[PDB]
Design a protein around this nucleic acid. Structure first.
Length: 342
DNA sequence: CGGGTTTTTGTTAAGGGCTGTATCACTGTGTAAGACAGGCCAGATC
């Protein structure tokens, strides 16, 4: 609700649109910098902390058994519960979409010195093609976990890809993929309630249901206001997945999800039209099976945002939301704000 | 096949004048950040 200016230290150039902040025990960690990692930090994972409205990026190291994951510009982050995250897909600095899947965690911690353990996972079966801008969630059904991947964009197939349109992209199939983190197996489910490739959407996870919000469709160049429900079930045989469309959706892409209190989320940022930008917020309340998308009072935006053309941010995790806008080039290429909701 | 006769070229005894080429001393394009090793203060500490 309250906006605030935050100054960045010397390595401000390492922040680019598409970064991914990750939180481990009330500690936000930066990831997804610009270019390949230099000798200042061979790993590329920073300590995103703010003291008295001032940003200082500190480096971090990995354990003696990690895997030096490359920087990714549009992965699909996801929490998991010891506590650990999952990274899948994204654009490498060489403009190559990665097909692997990553698992970050903490190995040793003392005196604010965190040592990570990056473990690569081998996925077999109905594996998804390399994507970017998609989402993945975890559902809990009958004492079991399962990853729910959906959406995303990718290049043309290896046969239909020509060098004259080498950078052309298209939406992926509306299939739903369940990923078992223990065995490392995927499974492709096609559903009759999904006919449009969706990307840059918002996903809300619960015990057994995930809620898809907004997005964009390249096949139509439209911002549909959709509200989907996917209640994954985990019986003793084969997991049965169902879908359901719900009224009262939001038309937005590239929004920022957060969590103020339990069982209620807040949406901020995004884009209504191509040249139009979403300035209002949105409150999302949850229950046992019901959903409610309401409206709250818009924050006091400054003259910088109201006339900017693009912005990018991510959930800090503890109610706050990081945000950045471009600027002059010569100078400071980007200004950065923080927004708290509590 | 030759004499006799013709046509169309060479030709330097020396100067005037137009045209082409070597010569001279220089020029512009190489033009922003990253790695690293030493020094020094705040600080956990046995």
């Amino acid at each position: 609700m309250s906006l605030q200016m935050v100054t960045v230290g010397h390595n401000i150039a390492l922040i680019q649109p598409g970064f991914s902040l990750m939180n481990f025990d009330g500690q936000v960690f930066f990831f997804g910098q610009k270019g390949w990692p230099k000798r200042s930090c061979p790993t590329g994972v920073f300590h995103f902390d703010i003291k008295q409205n001032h940003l200082k990026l500190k480096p971090a190291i990995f354990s003696k058994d990690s895997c030096y994951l490359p920087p990714l510009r549009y992965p699909a982050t996801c929490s998991y519960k010891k506590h650990q995250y999952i990274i899948h897909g994204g654009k490498t600095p060489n403009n190559e979409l990665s097909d692997k899947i990553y698992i970050m965690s903490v190995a040793c911690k003392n005196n604010k010195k965190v040592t990570f353990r990056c473990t690569e996972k081998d996925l077999v079966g109905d594996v998804p093609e390399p994507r970017y801008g998609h989402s993945i969630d975890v559902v809990y059904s009958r004492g079991k976990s399962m990853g729910v991947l959906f959406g995303g964009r990718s290049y043309m197939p290896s046969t239909q890809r020509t060098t004259e349109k080498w950078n052309s992209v298209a939406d992926c199939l509306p299939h739903v993929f369940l990923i078992d983190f223990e065995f490392g197996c995927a499974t492709s489910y096609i559903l009759p309630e999904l006919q449009d490739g969706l990307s840059f959407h918002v996903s809300i996870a619960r015990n057994d249901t995930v809620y898809i919000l907004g997005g964009h469709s390249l096949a139509s160049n439209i911002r549909p206001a959709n509200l989907y429900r996917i209640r994954v079930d985990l019986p003793l045989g084969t997991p049965a997945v169902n879908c359901t469309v719900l009224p009262g959706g939001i038309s937005v892409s590239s929004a920022i999800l957060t969590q103020t209190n339990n069982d209620e989320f807040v949406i901020v940022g995004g884009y209504q039209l191509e040249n139009q930008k979403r300035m209002v917020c949105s409150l999302v309340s949850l229950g046992d099976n019901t959903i409610e998308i309401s409206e709250m009072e818009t924050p006091d935006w400054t003259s910088d945002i109201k006339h900017s053309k693009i912005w990018f941010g991510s959930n800090m995790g503890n109610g706050t939301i990081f945000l950045g806008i471009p600027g002059d080039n010569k100078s400071e290429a980007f200004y950065f704000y923080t927004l708290r909701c509590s």
